[PDB]
Amino acid sequence: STGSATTTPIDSLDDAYITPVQIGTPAQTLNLDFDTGSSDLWVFSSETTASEVXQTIYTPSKSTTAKLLSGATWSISYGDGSSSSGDVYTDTVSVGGLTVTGQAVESAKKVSSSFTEDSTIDGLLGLAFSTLNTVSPTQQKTFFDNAKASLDSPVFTADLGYHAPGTYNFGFIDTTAYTGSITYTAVSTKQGFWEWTSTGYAVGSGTFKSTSIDGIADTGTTLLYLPATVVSAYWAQVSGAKSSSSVGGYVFPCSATLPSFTFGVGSARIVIPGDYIDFGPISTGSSSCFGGIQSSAGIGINIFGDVALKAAFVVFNGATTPTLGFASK
């Protein structure tokens, strides 16, 4: 079988995208953030501490096909400190027509204040490799994993938009979706992440510095985090730009026409348009804007978040030896 489902930005800034997913019998529909940098399918549920709930929730006991996975428990924290935990159910999950039975659904007993305050995200969906699944004591399989048997092809594609909706496909690659050919590149799973290595970078119409950048493809992340000197290299091409401790990252006059950033993928070159890099005014009506490229020194890993991913059509090849395809859009 195959699957097609729309993904739409939760706001004006493209901070993240949510996709509708259908849980249980009869189908309860939640908008979860598809996250290729994690491996847990969890959502707000009837079990969640009420003062911590502001979200559409999953009610286990109103689903016929739901089953409690005895003694299993989960606890997760993400890159920004946010976290959540609860118990586990298995149940039927559907994405854009693709239906999986027995998928582990992690019921949230408690969630951190950031999740609480986001009314648009009802839960997350892990699309990273299963070794990062927090279910204890026996790790559960991700949606993709569970689905791989019945997929026409063991692949999923991310087609995120720039301030527009996009698509997540499972089982096939929509050739109409991109321009040129897809350049595949090796993936390391030692870190459980879709981890790869760019061939380099080019700022604006500047030269392509050939240098190896090990990062991850992380749909759950907004910005593009690269080493400090790359990033410096960027911003120095923008007159008004400077780093700001107060904002915590490079700021520049909103009226600035931003240079493109080019990253390597094999002999291929992906070009993020300048606009993608203007993220927004630091507060509504401000003269200063926040940069879409930032140093990853403090994080500890290079992260190709949504600002770089919406710039391309991305293929997540889930063959036994996984690959990553990149095509321009």
Partner: peptide, 7 residues
Amino acid sequence: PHLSXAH
């Protein structure tokens, strides 16, 4: 807002 999804 700003999201950074499991370190």
